[PDB]
């Protein structure tokens, strides 16, 4: 009775980073070995746990967060980072115990002329506390004048689109990201390996 990791990694559609998706994994047997022998994951780093000791440890819950960002932005999915994505879209805590997996997806996420469907949040009054999710679409007041929900000067729609063309540099190419949070609580563990 395996865990539905195919649903998370092999899905046809990924969410945009401002509306990052969370799948709860529980009451199943997770085999993490498929990571090591994948040889097709550009980014694979784990924090607060050993990468190879995953099959030996159990957890009460596992949380898979998934979204799409640019290549040179993948470095922002890590504890104590700053930038557009880490400040306004997806913030990992300092005490983060989990892993971050990412891979190039230019072939199925870009399109000739550009794929403008994947969005990211560009403006926010404050920063995101860890694992916060902001999907509000209120016009951001960047100036000293009221907007009253009307776009124009100093009044910007808080979400901007990604310009994913197949002929971009790898930094400006779409990258799919999965963030596995391992949760340990005073409760029966429900996600193990062998």
């Amino acid at each position: 009775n395996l865990c539905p990791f195919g649903e998370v990694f092999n899905a046809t559609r990924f969410a945009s980073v401002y509306a990052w998706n969370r799948k709860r994994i529980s009451n199943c047997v997770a085999d993490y070995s498929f990571l090591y022998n994948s040889a097709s994951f550009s980014t694979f780093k784990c924090y607060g746990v050993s990468p190879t000791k995953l099959n030996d440890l159990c957890f009460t819950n596992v949380y898979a967060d998934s979204f799409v960002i640019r290549g040179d932005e993948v470095r922002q999915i890590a504890p104590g980072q700053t930038g557009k994505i880490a400040d306004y879209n997806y913030k990992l805590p300092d005490d983060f115990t989990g892993c971050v997996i990412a891979w190039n997806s230019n072939n199925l996420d870009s399109k000739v002329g550009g794929n403008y469907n994947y969005l990211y949040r560009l403006f926010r009054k404050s920063n995101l506390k860890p694992f916060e999710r902001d999907i509000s679409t209120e016009i951001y007041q960047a100036g000293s004048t009221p907007c009253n929900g009307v776009e124009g000067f100093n009044c910007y729609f808080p979400l901007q689109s990604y310009g994913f063309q197949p002929t971009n540099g790898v930094g400006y190419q779409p990258y799919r990201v999965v963030v596995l949070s391992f949760e340990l609580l005073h409760a029966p563990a429900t996600v193990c390996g062998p």
Epitope: G143, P146, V150, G152, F153, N154
Partner: antibody
Framework: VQLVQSEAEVKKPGSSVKVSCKAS????????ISWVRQAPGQGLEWMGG????????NYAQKFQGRVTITADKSTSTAYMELSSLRSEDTAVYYC?????????????????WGQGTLVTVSS | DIQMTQSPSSLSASVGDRVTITCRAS??????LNWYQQKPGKAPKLLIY???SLQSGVPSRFSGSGSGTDFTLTISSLQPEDFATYYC?????????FGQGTKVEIKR
């Protein structure tokens, strides 16, 4: 010169026109570029704008669905495309520039205007 | 949509006169009011940008005053290169709107 615009255009009604505006110098330097038109013997009318350093564009409600303003940092040139043209669109289109006014934390005045591009729409 | 109405529409003055142009907004816009000068055939040049702040390179004889709904551009000791059309424009609310203009013509 500080701002140069493309030459005049003559278009039949229903066609589309795309005007260019090059900022003299190397880059945009966080300026904002707006487009304002003036019909013969009329006043000035804002249509839309773009912030190249940020990659954002806004448009007036009177021109929603018809205008698209873009920018190329490589050539340091802004473009404004107006489609589904009408006789009323015949006017002089100025490309103007706005500096970030730190005292009010935004763009609040046009400090430099281009010479203007005449667009004539007629049967 | 704030309507900016200027007064007067036309004005006749001679060199060395004190000229005042009033600009009224349909609703309060604080001090987010700008004054532009335009001559026939050429592009507009900025004169005043904070209801009262002088744009660098403009003679001191130009001064803006006013706040809320009433504003005034005053030019003391009109000079020959000052005969032109003057527009006021508000930046408080989108969309930004201009006035219909005031033409300052030579009196003879």
């Amino acid at each position: 010169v500080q701002l140069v615009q493309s030459e005049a255009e003559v278009k039949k009604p229903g066609s589309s026109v795309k005007v260019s505006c090059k900022a003299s110098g190397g880059t945009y330097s966080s300026y904002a570029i707006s487009w304002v038109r003036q019909a013969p013997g009329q006043g000035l009318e804002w249509m839309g704008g773009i912030i190249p350093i940020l990659g954002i564009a806004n448009y007036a409600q009177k021109f929603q669905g018809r205008v698209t303003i873009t920018a190329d940092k490589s050539t340091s040139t802004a473009y404004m495309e107006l489609s589904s043209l009408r006789s009323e669109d015949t006017a002089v289109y100025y490309c103007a520039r706005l500096p970030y006014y730190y005292d009010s934390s935004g763009y609040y005045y046009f400090d430099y205007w281009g010479q203007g591009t005449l667009v004539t729409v007629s049967s | 949509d704030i309507q900016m109405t200027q007064s007067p529409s036309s004005l006749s003055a001679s060199v060395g006169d004190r000229v005042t142009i009033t600009c009224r907004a349909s609703q309060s816009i604080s001090s987010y009011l700008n004054w532009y000068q335009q001559k026939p055939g050429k592009a507009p040049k900025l004169l005043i940008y904070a209801a009262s702040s002088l744009q660098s390179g403009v003679p001191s004889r130009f001064s803006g005053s006013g706040s809320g709904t009433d504003f005034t551009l005053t030019i003391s000791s009109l000079q020959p290169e000052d005969f032109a059309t003057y527009y006021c424009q508000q930046s408080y609310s989108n969309p930004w709107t201009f006035g219909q203009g005031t033409k300052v013509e030579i009196k003879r």
